[PDB]
């Protein structure tokens, strides 16, 4: 049971590192969304301002 | 009853026997019991190591 528990723990230990890294993967997609919509917002403010 | 040197022969055999059994009868059995003690103790500690 000591070796079997070490294997059970070894799987749960590593799977949580992969799952936790996926939160950072969602954060990188969110960072890209913030920057891409900021570029579109900046383009929108640029074309809105020059019209005046 | 009658008093004889019979006690000498039995006492001499006993002194030699007491010195012999301490080296060839007790050590093999006490070691075989200490091994099981150690195996039960470390076997129970193995479950505590797995639980930690």
Swiss-Prot record, chain B:
**In terms of domain of life, where is this protein from?**
Bacteria
Its transmembrane ranges are: 12-32
The secretion signal range is none
The subcellular localization recorded is:
Cell inner membrane
The UniProt entry's sequence similarity note says: Belongs to the ATPase B chain family.
- Describe, as the record does, how this protein assembles with itself and its partners: F-type ATPases have 2 components, F(1) - the catalytic core - and F(0) - the membrane proton channel. F(1) has five subunits: alpha(3), beta(3), gamma(1), delta(1), epsilon(1). F(0) has three main subunits: a(1), b(2) and c(10-14). The alpha and beta chains form an alternating ring which encloses part of the gamma chain. F(1) is attached to F(0) by a central stalk formed by the gamma and epsilon chains, while a peripheral stalk is formed by the delta and b chains.
Q: What does this protein do?
A: F(1)F(0) ATP synthase produces ATP from ADP in the presence of a proton or sodium gradient. F-type ATPases consist of two structural domains, F(1) containing the extramembraneous catalytic core and F(0) containing the membrane proton channel, linked together by a central stalk and a peripheral stalk. During catalysis, ATP synthesis in the catalytic domain of F(1) is coupled via a rotary mechanism of the central stalk subunits to proton translocation.
Task: Name it.
Answer: ATP synthase subunit b
* Originating organism: Pseudomonas aeruginosa (strain UCBPP-PA14)
- Shown segment, full-protein numbering: 1 to 52 of 156
